[PDB]
Amino acid sequence: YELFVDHPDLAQWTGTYPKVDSSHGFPFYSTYEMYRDFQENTLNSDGSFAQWITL
Amino acid sequence: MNRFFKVSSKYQYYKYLEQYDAAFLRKYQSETHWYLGRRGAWKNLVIKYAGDHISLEEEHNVKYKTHLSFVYLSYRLAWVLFAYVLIYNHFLLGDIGKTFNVGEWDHRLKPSAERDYPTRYESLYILDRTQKW
Amino acid sequence: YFSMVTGLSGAALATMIRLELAHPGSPFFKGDSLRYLQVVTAHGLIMVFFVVVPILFGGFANFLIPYHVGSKDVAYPRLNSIGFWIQPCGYILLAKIGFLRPQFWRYYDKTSFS
Amino acid sequence: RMTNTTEEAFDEVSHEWQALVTSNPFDLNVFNYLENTQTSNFGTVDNPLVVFTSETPFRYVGCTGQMNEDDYEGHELLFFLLREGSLQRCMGCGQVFKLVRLRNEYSPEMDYYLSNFHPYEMQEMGESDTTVLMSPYKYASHYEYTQFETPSNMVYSMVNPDEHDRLLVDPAYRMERTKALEEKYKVYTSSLREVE
Amino acid sequence: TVINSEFLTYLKSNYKISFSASNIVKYLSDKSVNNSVILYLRKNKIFNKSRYSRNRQTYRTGAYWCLYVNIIAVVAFYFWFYKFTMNFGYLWWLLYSLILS
Amino acid sequence: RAGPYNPNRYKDYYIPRTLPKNEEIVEFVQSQHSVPASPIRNQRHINPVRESGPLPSYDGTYTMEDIRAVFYNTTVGRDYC
Amino acid sequence: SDPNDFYRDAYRNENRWIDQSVFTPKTSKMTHYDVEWPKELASRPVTKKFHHDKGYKYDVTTPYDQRYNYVADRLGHPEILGNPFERLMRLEGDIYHPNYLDQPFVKVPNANPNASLNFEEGEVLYENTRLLEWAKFWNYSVVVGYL
Amino acid sequence: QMFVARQVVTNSKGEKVEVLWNAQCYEDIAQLNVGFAPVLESVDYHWEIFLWADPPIKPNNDFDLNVPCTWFEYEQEWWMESCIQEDQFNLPEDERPYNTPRNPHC
Amino acid sequence: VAIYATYIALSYINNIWKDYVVRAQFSKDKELLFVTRVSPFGTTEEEVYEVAHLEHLPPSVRSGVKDLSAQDADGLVDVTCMSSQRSLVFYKGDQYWNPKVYNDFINQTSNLWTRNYTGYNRLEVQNSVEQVKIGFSHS
Amino acid sequence: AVGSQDILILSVVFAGISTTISFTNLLITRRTLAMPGLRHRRVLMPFVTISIFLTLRMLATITPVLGAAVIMMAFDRHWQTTFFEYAYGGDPILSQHLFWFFGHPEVYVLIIPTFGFINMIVPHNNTRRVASKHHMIWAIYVMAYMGYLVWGHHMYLVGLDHRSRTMYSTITIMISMPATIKVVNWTLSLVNGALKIDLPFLFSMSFLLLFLVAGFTGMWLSHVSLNVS
Amino acid sequence: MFRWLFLYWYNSTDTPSAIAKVNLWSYINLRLFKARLSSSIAYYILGLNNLELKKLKIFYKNTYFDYIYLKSIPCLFLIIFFTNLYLFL
Ligand SMILES: CCCCCCCCCCCCCCCCCC(=O)OC[C@H](COP(=O)([O-])OCC(O)COP(=O)([O-])OC[C@@H](COC(=O)CCCCCCCCCCCCCCCCC)OC(=O)CCCCCCCCCCCCCCCCC)OC(=O)CCCCCCCCCCCCCCCCC
Ligand SMILES: CCCCCCCCCCCCCCCCCC(=O)OC[C@H](COP(=O)([O-])OCC(O)COP(=O)([O-])OC[C@@H](COC(=O)CCCCCCCCCCCCCCCCC)OC(=O)CCCCCCCCCCCCCCCCC)OC(=O)CCCCCCCCCCCCCCCCC
Numbered sequence A: 001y002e003l004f005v006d007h008p009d010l011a012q013w014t015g016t017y018p019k020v021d022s023s024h025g026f027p028f029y030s031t032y033e034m035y036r037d038f039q040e041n042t043l044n045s046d047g048s049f050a051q052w053i054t055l
Numbered sequence B: 001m002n003r004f005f006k007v008s009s010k011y012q013y014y015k016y017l018e019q020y021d022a023a024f025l026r027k028y029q030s031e032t033h034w035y036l037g038r039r040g041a042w043k044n045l046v047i048k049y050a051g052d053h054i055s056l057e058e059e060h061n062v063k064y065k066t067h068l069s070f071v072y073l074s075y076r077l078a079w080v081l082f083a084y085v086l087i088y089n090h091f092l093l094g095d096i097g098k099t100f101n102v103g104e105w106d107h108r109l110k111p112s113a114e115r116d117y118p119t120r121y122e123s124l125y126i127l128d129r130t131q132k133w
Numbered sequence C: 001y002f003s004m005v006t007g008l009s010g011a012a013l014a015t016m017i018r019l020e021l022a023h024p025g026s027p028f029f030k031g032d033s034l035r036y037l038q039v040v041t042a043h044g045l046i047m048v049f050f051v052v053v054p055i056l057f058g059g060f061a062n063f064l065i066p067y068h069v070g071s072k073d074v075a076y077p078r079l080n081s082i083g084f085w086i087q088p089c090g091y092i093l094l095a096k097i098g099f100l101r102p103q104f105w106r107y108y109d110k111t112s113f114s
Numbered sequence D: 001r002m003t004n005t006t007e008e009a010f011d012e013v014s015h016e017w018q019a020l021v022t023s024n025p026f027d028l029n030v031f032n033y034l035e036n037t038q039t040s041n042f043g044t045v046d047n048p049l050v051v052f053t054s055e056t057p058f059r060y061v062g063c064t065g066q067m068n069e070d071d072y073e074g075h076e077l078l079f080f081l082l083r084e085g086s087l088q089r090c091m092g093c094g095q096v097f098k099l100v101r102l103r104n105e106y107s108p109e110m111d112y113y114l115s116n117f118h119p120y121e122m123q124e125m126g127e128s129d130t131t132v133l134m135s136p137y138k139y140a141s142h143y144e145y146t147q148f149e150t151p152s153n154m155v156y157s158m159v160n161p162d163e164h165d166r167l168l169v170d171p172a173y174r175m176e177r178t179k180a181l182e183e184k185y186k187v188y189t190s191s192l193r194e195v196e
Numbered sequence E: 001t002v003i004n005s006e007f008l009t010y011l012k013s014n015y016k017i018s019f020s021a022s023n024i025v026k027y028l029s030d031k032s033v034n035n036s037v038i039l040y041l042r043k044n045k046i047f048n049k050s051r052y053s054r055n056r057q058t059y060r061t062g063a064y065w066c067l068y069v070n071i072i073a074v075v076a077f078y079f080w081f082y083k084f085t086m087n088f089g090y091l092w093w094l095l096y097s098l099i100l101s
Numbered sequence F: 001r002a003g004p005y006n007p008n009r010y011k012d013y014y015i016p017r018t019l020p021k022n023e024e025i026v027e028f029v030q031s032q033h034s035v036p037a038s039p040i041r042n043q044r045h046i047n048p049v050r051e052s053g054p055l056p057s058y059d060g061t062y063t064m065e066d067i068r069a070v071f072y073n074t075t076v077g078r079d080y081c
Numbered sequence G: 001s002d003p004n005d006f007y008r009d010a011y012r013n014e015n016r017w018i019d020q021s022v023f024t025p026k027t028s029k030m031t032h033y034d035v036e037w038p039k040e041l042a043s044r045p046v047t048k049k050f051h052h053d054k055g056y057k058y059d060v061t062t063p064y065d066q067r068y069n070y071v072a073d074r075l076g077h078p079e080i081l082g083n084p085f086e087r088l089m090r091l092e093g094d095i096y097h098p099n100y101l102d103q104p105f106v107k108v109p110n111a112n113p114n115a116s117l118n119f120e121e122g123e124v125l126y127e128n129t130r131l132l133e134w135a136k137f138w139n140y141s142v143v144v145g146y147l
Numbered sequence H: 001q002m003f004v005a006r007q008v009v010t011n012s013k014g015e016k017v018e019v020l021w022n023a024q025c026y027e028d029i030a031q032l033n034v035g036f037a038p039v040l041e042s043v044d045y046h047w048e049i050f051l052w053a054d055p056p057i058k059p060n061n062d063f064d065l066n067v068p069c070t071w072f073e074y075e076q077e078w079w080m081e082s083c084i085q086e087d088q089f090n091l092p093e094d095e096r097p098y099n100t101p102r103n104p105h106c
Numbered sequence I: 001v002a003i004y005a006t007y008i009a010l011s012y013i014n015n016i017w018k019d020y021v022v023r024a025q026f027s028k029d030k031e032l033l034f035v036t037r038v039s040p041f042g043t044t045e046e047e048v049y050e051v052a053h054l055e056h057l058p059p060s061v062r063s064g065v066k067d068l069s070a071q072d073a074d075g076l077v078d079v080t081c082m083s084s085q086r087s088l089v090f091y092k093g094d095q096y097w098n099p100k101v102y103n104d105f106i107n108q109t110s111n112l113w114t115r116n117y118t119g120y121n122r123l124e125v126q127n128s129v130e131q132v133k134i135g136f137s138h139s
Numbered sequence J: 001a002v003g004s005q006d007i008l009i010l011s012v013v014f015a016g017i018s019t020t021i022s023f024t025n026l027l028i029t030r031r032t033l034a035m036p037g038l039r040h041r042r043v044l045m046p047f048v049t050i051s052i053f054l055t056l057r058m059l060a061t062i063t064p065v066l067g068a069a070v071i072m073m074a075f076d077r078h079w080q081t082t083f084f085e086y087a088y089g090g091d092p093i094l095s096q097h098l099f100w101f102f103g104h105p106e107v108y109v110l111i112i113p114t115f116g117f118i119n120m121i122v123p124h125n126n127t128r129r130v131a132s133k134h135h136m137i138w139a140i141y142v143m144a145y146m147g148y149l150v151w152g153h154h155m156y157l158v159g160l161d162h163r164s165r166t167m168y169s170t171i172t173i174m175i176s177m178p179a180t181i182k183v184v185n186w187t188l189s190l191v192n193g194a195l196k197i198d199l200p201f202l203f204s205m206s207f208l209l210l211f212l213v214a215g216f217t218g219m220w221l222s223h224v225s226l227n228v229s
Numbered sequence K: 001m002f003r004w005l006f007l008y009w010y011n012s013t014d015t016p017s018a019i020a021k022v023n024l025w026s027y028i029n030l031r032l033f034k035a036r037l038s039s040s041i042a043y044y045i046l047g048l049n050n051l052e053l054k055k056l057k058i059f060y061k062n063t064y065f066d067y068i069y070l071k072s073i074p075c076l077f078l079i080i081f082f083t084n085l086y087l088f089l
């Protein structure tokens, strides 16, 4: 959460989701698109077989 | 405050400085308005209008554009040479001897090459040169 | 359109190769092994670097990437135009080697007269 | 480092500075960074998803349905043309879109959409004394550093084209208007202090 | 600045303040206001709806530069490795087209 | 042909051409802060309702079973029924 | 400034109808904005003939005689004319382009000095003639060294 | 090709509003038919997809501001379920055992 | 390389020498100043300036005053033309000045370098600005 | 001798530079002008665009190697640098290594974009979502970034060490799996949908029919003993 | 100066419509720096009458090396004791 609030670009690079909650209704001022390549091209995700072959 | 004292000029327009403070004049004509302070700045508008149009894109300097004669010569030569290349490489490859001329020039250290001669004058002159080290 | 022209050139080179390989004895090149090798190399290079690449990365990419990414134009319209206009020289160079030889004259030309 | 708007700002640069300083929705939508657009709610009839345009009738919109943490996408992307007028709906998921054609004006209707835009980034404005950072470690996380500082004592005021030309050509008029604006700024500050 | 007491009393009577100002200018002192510098923004009709400024829609110099690149490549390669120079006189009418142009 | 055009060669009136008065500015600030400001947009769903109609009933004139019994009869031909 | 105490009263479901209703707040009218600006905006000239494809009803040109005069300085600016060398060379310069010189709202300075100025020589204030000799020496020395 | 359907819906504020269903494309704006007439034919051909350079938008919804699915949400698994059912065999009710002993602890 | 190196060298030498003033003469009415400066080859080149435009401006950085050449009795005085954005450099030595117009010239081209450039004390902080009266003529 | 060989060398360098310009322009276009919401979501973009970008990245990775090899060939031909002359340290097999390191990724670049055409056309005519788009994307990516370690299957018999030979053969045979994944995804994309038969669909079917045999023959070539003959 | 988005957007008097009357736009009033949330996790949960914000603060960020070394002394002594046991074993 500290990383997301202070350095949004690094949070997006690492793939962290926006850690703030907008339940009050006002969207946050530093939201960004999700870069999930690191968490998706992994042995535990849709790239499981590709990562097994690469390993 | 240190107001501007007087303007010893016969041009009544310049007397506007007498109505302001020296600090104000420095702030708005010396610190960040140095390139704009007490200047007409008509050149700014002229250059903006010059840059924001669809005028000729051939540029030589920031002050002058390319010479139209040079531009036209370059364009005509480019078009004609491109047409020659395409036509010769697509239609006139049957007779290479008739379609192309053989020529070259080698280093002056080595003896003059047999093909080193002025084209269109090989029937009128023979070229040779003295080797150099 | 340039890709169509280059593909026709490659098809012509393939036709030359197939006519030479139709039956033994070199019915097409009549013994010019060097010319046949040059034609084969020209065919391969033209098909690889000047048919499929222009079709995919030249026409299809330039036509589709703006649509599929939401851009008014490519980041380098000048470079796109340059890449388009640069192809013909390489295409000709890799396609006309079969015709062009340093020894242009034929075996029955009396070079001793010149 | 900060550009002198009264001397150099024109057309596109002036509009960018207006977007930076006023954050008016019309300019902010035009100059919003392409990489990130503020996340919004799911479109509904009562609370439709608002798509902003800058004096244009239609915009190419894309929809992927209800987003989930596991997948981040509801349905495969479908593109349509969101046009100005009544609300519109997506067939696949029923998401409701509303096209707001912002106008170059300062009105409560436009101010109503202030919260729907990211603040315009300032770090990339002006002139940079560093071309680019040659750092593979932070090529996508750090902007170029600055040797100098950014002044924060600048007050901007909008001007018409003919008035701006008058300010440029006539230094006396420029000084007069500057002094008047300074007096008005003093009055505004005093009024705010009294209200507080 | 100085605000008349009667004017301030009239303002208070006609308006009762119940909300706090959101502008940060309220915190400024007279020194900061004096040190503030005024800048002018040119406001006109907006036609470009993108961050990037208007870009020219034609590259004539680029097209001709590419034509020259092609010509240089072909001619240089043929001359260096084939030693062949195109005989422009064979199709004399294109050379005459250049001369006429 | 319409002819050459340049929109920047004509005056614009997006900003008032006369500066305000000091007393008017003070009174405007007083009045603005003496009354509530216009609301800003909020994106919170308040008592959200189904986008479609009521959920099909367990029993009644039309039930979810009737909908379920339609997937198996699906045809798009070249002629009307 | 307790956030929960503020929010629980500020945002309520039963007030949704009035919470998101846009209105113009009641504020004192300002003559420069609510009186003067509408008048000048409505009094804009209208032209029957305007660029149909790109123009607007209010695209009315300002006459040259009505354009503001240039009074910043008396000294002329011959750069506008275009020097005879450039004219002979046929070079095209933006500074002396007629279209860019034809500004819409302000007249460009006259190429000639204002008639008020008198160029009769007066008396010498400052004079350092040895600067010419020093400059010649340094320039020749640098040229020789560079060669 | 502009709108594939329309409806009139009364919102929570009591006002009736019109909702139009835009024609859609499978991820391909090139295949999308950009027209301004009630015609299926692709008549208009545009050299500049973005005439004014305004970028398109692919909005991303915040999970916090999302709403539970209610646009025929009961149909998401219908396709797969019915595909399985078509080949599934169902025992007749009369032959299916009924009124079996109750579980002791339930 | 040769052509452009020669051109750059000559042009930048001329630019460096342009600032320095060789001769300065008032007009008959003292309304214009004719300035003779160095040319690319070391000859005389004429220019015209307006005395009103001419002004001696303080440095932007207030800690760099001590580094000005004017600190020395035989230094250089940098006079800036605010209209043409040009700089005129004069030797401080009285040998180069006419002693019956120098006083008026320096009292007329030094109007923007005042006491307040160094700051305000607590006796003059209030008077640094003109007080604004609001609502005294009407409620 | 001097002539067509040198012309081909210089034209190969020329085409390498042209490809440099092309992929630079396209990749920067994607990275800087992509619409909001599609900046990083590769899945949402049509498969053809994804394949094109992956192939452009592969070309960027491999082009400098080919350029260096071709430049060395030109230097050996003209200046006689003896880079590939065994007499004084030259390595003739180094030329083959450098060429094939780009050559195999070159054919992979040629093929990868072809899959996108079918992956887009089949859903369009079937009125159905494509089967396992994420898995197909990951399969093409694994093929792309594992084709950099199989360039030696064109050099089995050249005389390289058995260790490298075995590594190349093993990775080459392993490459077959993602192709099978793509084939099964294509097959499953045709089931349980509303088919709209069209000429693009027929072309896609012909493409699948040809690709099956092509890849099968490639896998057979991966057999080392058969590859010898 | 606001910490919470709801408080920031509840009653805004410095909006462009209001500021256009004076036509003065100070650089110190940029929306970029106008509001900024705290670095501690805050999440909303349903209360008895409305949503309420709960803060999840796990650890402090101002501990010093003296405290850290005092806490680490037992680990060092245990390492020494285990090594001595191994040597004597
Ligand atoms: C050694 C050579 C050294 C050379 C030095 C050269 C020095 C000079 C350099 C100058 C050039 C600098 C710029 C380079 C640009 C390259 C091109 C490019 O992409 O630019 C994009 C760039 C911008 O375009 P873009 O499209 O925006 O780029 C998007 C990104 O590139 C994103 O692209 P994307 O979308 O395609 O992303 C793909 C990525 C995205 O996917 C991922 O996120 C990767 C996977 C992450 C999660 C993995 C989890 C696995 C599970 C856990 C671990 C399990 C194991 C057990 C342990 C755990 C147990 C619990 O996935 C992959 O494909 C990576 C493979 C992942 C497999 C992981 C296997 C791990 C096993 C360990 C051993 C193997 C490691 C291999 C490397 C792995 C990757 C780092 O292009 C430009 O700017 C224009 C072109 C510029 C060209 C410049 C000139 C280039 C010259 C290159 C010369 C190279 C010579 C040598 C070649 C041969 C080497 C063998
Ligand atoms: C590499 C050499 C190869 C040679 C091959 C053999 C060629 C021989 C025959 C050549 C002629 C063929 C017939 C065609 C003629 C042109 C018409 C045509 O159909 O072809 C168009 C043909 C191709 O069409 P295009 O280029 O596509 O059309 C676009 C053009 O831009 C056109 O655009 P535009 O219409 O806007 O421009 C029209 C303009 C042509 O466009 C121009 O404006 C180009 C520039 C013209 C003036 C160039 C010379 C003067 C430049 C000033 C600096 C000089 C050097 C410094 C001074 C000291 C000397 C070193 O026409 C003229 O005004 C030409 C009339 C003659 C002018 C003579 C003025 C002499 C002034 C001397 C006093 C001032 C200097 C100070 C002296 C010292 C004082 C102490 O264009 C040309 O040929 C352009 C030039 C043609 C005119 C001749 C220019 C040079 C004349 C020099 C005379 C000697 C001066 C020095 C004497 C010594 C004592 C001072």
Ligand SMILES: CCCCCCCCCCCCCCCCCC(=O)OC[C@H](COP(=O)([O-])OCC(O)COP(=O)([O-])OC[C@@H](COC(=O)CCCCCCCCCCCCCCCCC)OC(=O)CCCCCCCCCCCCCCCCC)OC(=O)CCCCCCCCCCCCCCCCC
Residues within 6 Å of the ligand: B072, B075, B076, B077, B079, B080, B082, B083, B086, B087, E060, E091, E093, E094, E097, E098, E100, E101
């Ligand atoms: C394609 C057909 C021709 C054009 C379209 C049709 C005509 C339209 C206008 C008609 C009405 C107005 C006429 C007044 C002139 C208006 C235009 C103008 O100023 O002139 C252009 C231009 C002069 O303008 P400029 O001052 O250079 O423009 C500068 C401006 O800044 C403007 O700059 P820019 O950006 O606009 O571009 C300037 C560029 C303008 O851009 C171009 O037009 C570029 C050149 C054309 C495209 C080349 C593509 C490459 C492949 C071409 C292959 C062609 C077929 C094979 C031909 C050779 C073997 C037979 O000018 C050049 O660079 C000219 C280069 C010299 C011409 C080279 C090509 C000659 C062959 C053209 C095709 C002829 C087809 C019919 C005959 C077929 C015989 C079997 O050149 C000429 O006036 C040359 C005219 C003479 C040559 C053409 C006719 C003879 C061709 C030889 C074979 C036939 C012999 C028997 C002829 C019997 C009597 C006809």
Ligand SMILES: CCCCCCCCCCCCCCCCCC(=O)OC[C@H](COP(=O)([O-])OCC(O)COP(=O)([O-])OC[C@@H](COC(=O)CCCCCCCCCCCCCCCCC)OC(=O)CCCCCCCCCCCCCCCCC)OC(=O)CCCCCCCCCCCCCCCCC
Residues within 6 Å of the ligand: B086, B087, B088, B090, B091, C001, C002, C005, C087, C088, C091
């Ligand atoms: C005598 C011939 C003997 C037999 C051999 C002939 C061999 C011909 C080439 C064979 C291969 C391609 C064949 C394509 C034919 C169909 C073209 C087509 O779709 O119709 C135009 C078509 C217009 O129809 P549309 O788009 O359905 O409807 C729009 C309306 O037309 C309304 O549009 P608008 O409002 O814009 O009105 C203008 C319209 C009205 O005009 C017409 O419709 C008249 C009829 C069509 C005339 C097309 C050519 C005109 C002359 C072009 C010369 C170069 C430009 C210089 C200026 C020329 C000024 C006239 O004109 C055009 O749109 C034509 C534009 C032409 C641009 C050409 C330059 C593009 C760059 C080069 C790309 C291709 C390179 C190939 C070679 C590569 C070698 C490595 O526009 C295009 O698609 C443009 C295609 C451009 C490329 C192909 C044409 C240029 C070929 C140059 C010669 C290459 C020779 C190579 C081998 C030999 C070397 C020595």
Ligand SMILES: CCCCCCCCCCCCCCCCCC(=O)OC[C@H](COP(=O)([O-])OCC(O)COP(=O)([O-])OC[C@@H](COC(=O)CCCCCCCCCCCCCCCCC)OC(=O)CCCCCCCCCCCCCCCCC)OC(=O)CCCCCCCCCCCCCCCCC
Residues within 6 Å of the ligand: B073, B077, B100, B101, B103, B118, B119, B120, E072, E075, E076, E079, E085, E086, E087, E088, E089, E090, E095, E099
């Ligand atoms: C009155 C005069 C006109 C004045 C008005 C203005 C005129 C404007 C003219 C502008 C000319 C632009 C350039 C044209 C180039 C043409 C090239 C060409 O086709 O040449 C061969 C051409 C025909 O020869 P060919 O035997 O058929 O074929 C060539 C052979 O195959 C092989 O032959 P080669 O082996 O000898 O190779 C030479 C060939 C090139 O052949 C090749 O393909 C071989 C290339 C080898 C290259 C080897 C190295 C590889 C390349 C790259 C190397 C660097 C590395 C790059 C890569 C990077 C690596 C790190 O190119 C040339 O012939 C060179 C050009 C000859 C001189 C022409 C200059 C004319 C005057 C220009 C200035 C005018 C303005 C002056 C001022 C005016 C105002 C005072 O010969 C000619 O030059 C004939 C045409 C001459 C036209 C002259 C101008 C028009 C006027 C004609 C007279 C009409 C009557 C006038 C009456 C006036 C009454 C008042």
Ligand code: HEA
Residues within 6 Å of the ligand: J107, J108, J110, J111, J153, J154, J172, J173, J175, J176, J179, J180, J183, J211, J212, J213, J214, J215, J216, J218, J219, J221, J222, J223, J227
């Ligand atoms: C588009 C071009 C392309 C593609 C995609 C491929 C793909 C593959 N190639 Fe090939 N290859 C070339 C172009 C290509 N190749 C060229 C041009 C040469 C020679 C270059 C020269 O020297 O000039 C070459 C040479 C070549 C060799 C060297 C042969 C030799 O020199 O003796 C080998 C060795 O293993 C090989 C292997 C493979 C493998 C394992 C794949 C894999 O990608 C294939 C994986 C896919 C499958 C294995 C499909 C699985 C099959 C099914 C699902 C269907 C099953 C149905 C039935 C059995 C009925 N290739």
Ligand SMILES: CCCCCCCCCCCCCCCCCC(=O)OC[C@H](COP(=O)([O-])OCC[N+](C)(C)C)OC(=O)CCCCCCCCCCCCCCCCC
Residues within 6 Å of the ligand: D133, D134, D135, D136, D139, D140, D141, D142, D143, J031, J057, J145
């Ligand atoms: C011997 C000679 C030595 C060299 C001498 C010359 C020195 C030159 C020094 C200057 C140039 C180099 C500087 C350092 C690098 C700078 C990079 C940079 O800034 O680029 C940003 C550029 C442009 O960035 P941008 O413009 O998008 O964003 C800038 C950042 N913001 C917006 C926040 C301001 O983008 C990239 O290229 C970076 C992303 C791609 C990086 C490569 C990823 C991998 C791609 C292939 C897939 C993986 C395959 C497997 C790999 C592993 C195998 C084992």
Ligand SMILES: [Ca+2]
Residues within 6 Å of the ligand: C020, C021, C022, C023, C024, C025, C026, C027
């Ligand atoms: Ca044979």
Ligand SMILES: [Cu+2]
Residues within 6 Å of the ligand: J103, J104, J105, J150, J151, J153, J154
């Ligand atoms: Cu291979």
Ligand SMILES: [Zn+2]
Residues within 6 Å of the ligand: D063, D064, D065, D075, D090, D091, D092, D093, D094, D095
């Ligand atoms: Zn949807």
